[PDB]
Amino acid sequence: TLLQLLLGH
Amino acid sequence: SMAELEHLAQNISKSHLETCQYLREELQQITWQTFLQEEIENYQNKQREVMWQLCAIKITEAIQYVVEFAKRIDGFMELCQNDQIVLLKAGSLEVVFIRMCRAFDSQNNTVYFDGKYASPDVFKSLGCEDFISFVFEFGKSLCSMHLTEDEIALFSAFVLMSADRSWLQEKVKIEKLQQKIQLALQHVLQKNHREDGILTKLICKVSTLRALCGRHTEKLMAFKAIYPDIVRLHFPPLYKELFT
Ligand SMILES: CC(C)=CCC[C@@H](C)[C@H]1CC[C@H]2C3=C(CC[C@]12C)[C@@]1(C)CC[C@H](O)[C@@](C)(C(=O)O)[C@@H]1CC3
Numbered sequence: 001t002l003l004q005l006l007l008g009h
Numbered sequence: 010s011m012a013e014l015e016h017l018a019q020n021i022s023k024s025h026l027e028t029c030q031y032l033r034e035e036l037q038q039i040t041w042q043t044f045l046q047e048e049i050e051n052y053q054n055k056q057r058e059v060m061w062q063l064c065a066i067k068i069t070e071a072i073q074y075v076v077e078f079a080k081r082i083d084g085f086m087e088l089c090q091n092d093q094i095v096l097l098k099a100g101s102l103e104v105v106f107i108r109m110c111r112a113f114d115s116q117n118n119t120v121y122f123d124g125k126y127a128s129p130d131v132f133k134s135l136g137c138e139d140f141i142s143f144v145f146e147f148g149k150s151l152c153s154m155h156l157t158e159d160e161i162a163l164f165s166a167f168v169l170m171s172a173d174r175s176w177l178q179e180k181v182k183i184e185k186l187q188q189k190i191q192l193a194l195q196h197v198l199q200k201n202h203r204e205d206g207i208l209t210k211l212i213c214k215v216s217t218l219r220a221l222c223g224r225h226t227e228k229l230m231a232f233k234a235i236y237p238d239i240v241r242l243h244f245p246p247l248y249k250e251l252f253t
Contacts, residue, residue, distance in 0.1 A: 007094070
């Protein structure tokens with residue numbers, strides 16, 4: 001989620 | 010080919026150098042920069058939950074640099090979105106512990122923490138001296154191998170690209186990338202005139218790494234079970250997200 005954001009997903 | 014392994018190593022090497030918080034040589038230079046007894050006592054006077062929150066902040070900042078490390082590895086970006094997340098969930102803290110060896114004084118058993126080199130006594134209030142001792146043990150062991158930055162980079166990428174994590178979808182593609190990373194690591198280690206027993210020593214460390222991360226996970230989940238509002242309200246979102 002935040003990880004998804006940071007990865008540019 | 011040999012050229013392909015050299016390119017792979019260069020990609021991973023540059024990603025690491027770009028995403029390390031501190032220069033290796035700078036960290037090694039200031040091992041004399043240690044917490045004074047008064048500063049140590051200050052940390053020791055913090056209540057367990059407060060000291061943990063401080064530590065989670067530091068861990069999470071380190072993890073943000075690891076996420077960026079991964080993003081700059083071309084092989085990692087080629088993976089599907091699901092697998093990227095799975096790998097980072099399971100592997101980011103492993104990379105943090107490897108990176109710790111860059112900021113560790115193996116002669117004096119100290120680690121660079123909150124601006125100075127800290128003994129295990131700095132972490133007294135966490136109430137888990139056995140876990141802390143294990144962390145310092147891993148640091149001292151790895152730091153005494155005197156790995157180059159490129160060797161650290163490839164070893165970091167190797168543990169991140171573990172094809173045996175649960176819930177992975179492109180197992181075959183990840184296995185291929187990990188095998189190539191390991192061949193590149195072997196090549197670099199040989200080039201730096203390391204004995205052939207160097208790589209098998211590193212492979213053994215992987216088990217230790219997982220055990221370390223295993224302890225951290227079970228500790229955090231126990232903390233969350235008893236103190237759910239503290240975790241939800243006061244711990245970093247990325248930290249909660251990756252580990253709980
Ligand atoms: C119960 C808990 C959370 C225990 C953890 C406590 C201890 C072991 C833990 C809390 C904070 C954490 C930490 C590192 C690894 C372990 C350690 C010290 C290192 C040194 C790794 C390398 C990074 O480059 C660097 C320098 C950074 O982010 O600047 C950090 C600094 C902060």
